[PDB]
Amino acid sequence: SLQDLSKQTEIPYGTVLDSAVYEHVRMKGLNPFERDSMYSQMWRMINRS
Amino acid sequence: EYDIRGIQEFLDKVSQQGMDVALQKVENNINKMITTLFDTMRIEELNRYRDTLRRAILVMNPATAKSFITEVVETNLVAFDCHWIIINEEINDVDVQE
Amino acid sequence: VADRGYGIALQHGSPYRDVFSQRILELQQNGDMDILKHKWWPKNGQCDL
Amino acid sequence: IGISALTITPDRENVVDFTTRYMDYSVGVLLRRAEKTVDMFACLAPFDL
Numbered sequence: 001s002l003q004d005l006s007k008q009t010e011i012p013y014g015t016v017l018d019s020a021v022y023e024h025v026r027m028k029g030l031n032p033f034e035r036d037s038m039y040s041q042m043w044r045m046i047n048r049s
Numbered sequence: 050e051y052d053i054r055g056i057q058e059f060l061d062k063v064s065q066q067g068m069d070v071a072l073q074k075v076e077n078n079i080n081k082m083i084t085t086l087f088d089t090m091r092i093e094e095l096n097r098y099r100d101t102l103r104r105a106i107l108v109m110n111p112a113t114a115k116s117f118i119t120e121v122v123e124t125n126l127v128a129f130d131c132h133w134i135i136i137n138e139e140i141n142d143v144d145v146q147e
Numbered sequence: 148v149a150d151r152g153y154g155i156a157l158q159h160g161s162p163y164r165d166v167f168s169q170r171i172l173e174l175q176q177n178g179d180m181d182i183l184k185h186k187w188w189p190k191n192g193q194c195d196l
Numbered sequence: 197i198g199i200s201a202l203t204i205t206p207d208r209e210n211v212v213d214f215t216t217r218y219m220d221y222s223v224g225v226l227l228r229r230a231e232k233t234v235d236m237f238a239c240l241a242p243f244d245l
Contacts, residue, residue, distance in 0.1 A: 023080065023084075026084065027080065027083070027084055027124075030084065030087035030088060031087055031124065031125075032087070032092055032095060033095075033099075033124070033125045033126065034125065035125070
């Protein structure tokens, strides 16, 4: 599941730069009012460097 | 596209009665607007900003308003206590039902 | 943590509160405030924090 | 007309009209398969030939 993918860090993950998926993830990862924290982990992985 | 010299008498007559009116302008790219806020403000401030959205007035054409409301609701910046006023001169019954 | 910051207090209605802001901005931009902080929170203490 | 994997979004829907959706969107992930855990000689692995 995406939750389990967000807990682990042994396998890195990413997407195509600036694609609609990248904006969609960044929209959630920064949001402090989101009910589900998962995306804050997904964003914290994708955004490195 | 709005010419703010319309509300120029409303802000005047309101600011004598002690209300904390704020302006803002709605961008063409509403997603880049909202994502600028979470990227450029403290959590100390976002919780003050949410308290202002409790009451708001939207002065725009319906096709923009539908899109803005849908995004503000999907981003959970408002909840069941909010009370927004929408004002315009031309809205047909097909749009009210959306 | 949000909603808090360190400070100091004065009498009810003390006008000397007008001094702080611009001078604190000076001290922060000069690093004088950071020099005082380093004076009172130096890194290589007796132990790793 | 336009037809593709084109996705309805609140910013696109401003300038062009859309019909009712004929299939739902979904974000997902591609991963490489894990390979079988079982092996015939797993008990002889600890030392090289």
